[PDB]
Write a protein that binds this DNA or RNA. Sequence first.
RNA 1: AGCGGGGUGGAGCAGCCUGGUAGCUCGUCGGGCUCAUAACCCGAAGAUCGUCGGUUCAAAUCCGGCCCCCGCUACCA
RNA 2: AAACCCGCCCUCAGUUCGGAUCGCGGGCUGCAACUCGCCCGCGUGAAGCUGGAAUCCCUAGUACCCGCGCGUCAUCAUCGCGC
RNA 3: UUAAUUGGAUUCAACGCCGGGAACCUCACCGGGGGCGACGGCAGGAUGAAGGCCAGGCUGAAGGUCUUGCCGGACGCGCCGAG
Lengths: 124, 130
Amino acid sequence: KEFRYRGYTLEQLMNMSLEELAKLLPARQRRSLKRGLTPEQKKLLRKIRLAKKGKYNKPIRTHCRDMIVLPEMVGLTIYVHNGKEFVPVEIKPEMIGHYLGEFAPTRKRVQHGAPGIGATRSSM
Amino acid sequence: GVIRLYPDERYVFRRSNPAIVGIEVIEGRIKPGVTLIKQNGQKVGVIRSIKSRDEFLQEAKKGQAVAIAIEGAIVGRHIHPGETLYVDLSRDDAITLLKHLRDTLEDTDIKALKMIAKVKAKEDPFWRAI
RNA sequence: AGCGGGGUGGAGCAGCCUGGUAGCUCGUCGGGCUCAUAACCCGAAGAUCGUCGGUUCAAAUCCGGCCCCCGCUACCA
RNA sequence: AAACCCGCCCUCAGUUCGGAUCGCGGGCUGCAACUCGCCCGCGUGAAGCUGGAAUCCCUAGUACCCGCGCGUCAUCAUCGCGC
RNA sequence: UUAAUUGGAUUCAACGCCGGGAACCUCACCGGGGGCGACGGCAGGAUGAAGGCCAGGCUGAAGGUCUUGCCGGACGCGCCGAG
Ligand code: MET
Ligand SMILES: [Mg+2]
Ligand SMILES: [Mg+2]
Ligand SMILES: [Mg+2]
Ligand SMILES: [Mg+2]
Ligand SMILES: [Mg+2]
Ligand SMILES: [Mg+2]
Ligand SMILES: [Mg+2]
């Protein structure tokens, strides 16, 4: 009932080089990692590692909706911009390999009202 | 006025044209020429005459039994024995009673009017707010 | 109280008799036609026959007790 | 180039018809592919059995059927203009 | 329906139309952050205007601002007209 990603425990995933890990993710993530991180993602990763070290005890808010979730990010809470606000996301082990923006919906669910004038041929 | 028919077969002395049946008063005052209605409001007709005995009467107060001869009411389809009958009320009359003629109102009258308003509070919100 | 009739889509009627499909008119929703509205044309939704049981190869039909209203006269406190 | 031609399998069936929808995996462009791109392999297998009242285009290398080029364009054509 | 789902066009003569196949840009919309006043004059200004920066906070990120002090020398939106 424990967590395993390709037959590897969480600890084994922690002690892996970036290149080693990329061989287990899908093709899209492997290509994205192979091309390197953008500067904004570099700053976000620096803040994340600083928080892991025991410093920076503040909320982590970001605009980087295209950041890929990494094993070392598990256990934290991140606030991802959705267009008008930062929503909290609690990272679970099963989120490895997904984009952050997948957990911050940008549109509100639709509840239709009564059709108005012009909705049918006879209503015009 | 609110009354209840006897569950007794004896009090029924004529079925139709006219309907002659005894009654005991629960609350209020019975007068000739007053329309009676049920909970659903069917027009059972207008009381044609009242008689406690062979003698002719004029009105009945609390705790008095009287045989009513009414028009437009038939046992069974229109009225059933042991069923409770209500006097139809005018909202203007109710306002007058509650505001103008508030001196001549007693326990039985106010109880009858209150429960009549509660019963009639089905279609017009005026009786719902009383 | 006794005699007599009938229960079928939202609405109003046939269809029983002679069992074996639930049809008519109106209303509701959608589409055509016209520059556009009414009129007109087409399609769809809506009752599995008031309840229980019996009968019958098979019952909206044949049958009953049962739910209801309708009709009549009887009935003078 | 395809429609076209030759040989073998299927024989009137929701099928060896139809390929929508979804799972796993592999790629390309790009500073960036989740919202919101395109391509490939295996798997899955929806409605649909010819269409009421109505209504459109076309007179000769024309209409029908079949593919291709250019524009847009880093990537993307069930489109427009041409062949 | 929504924070916004930018706008024009409604019979022929609006609806694969605006060459409109929008991931950024396009962009005109929504949330948030910065910057801009030739030329006249008013306060001010070498005893230094206007302006710029190492590190560190605020921040989505930022000498944008603040902390901490180092720069540069003649104009001056703190104010009124005007652009
Ligand atoms: C009739 O005879 C007379 N008893 C009517 C009143 S009944 C209580
Ligand atoms: Mg019309
Ligand atoms: Mg096939
Ligand atoms: Mg995607
Ligand atoms: Mg077929
Ligand atoms: Mg186009
Ligand atoms: Mg596009
Ligand atoms: Mg854009």
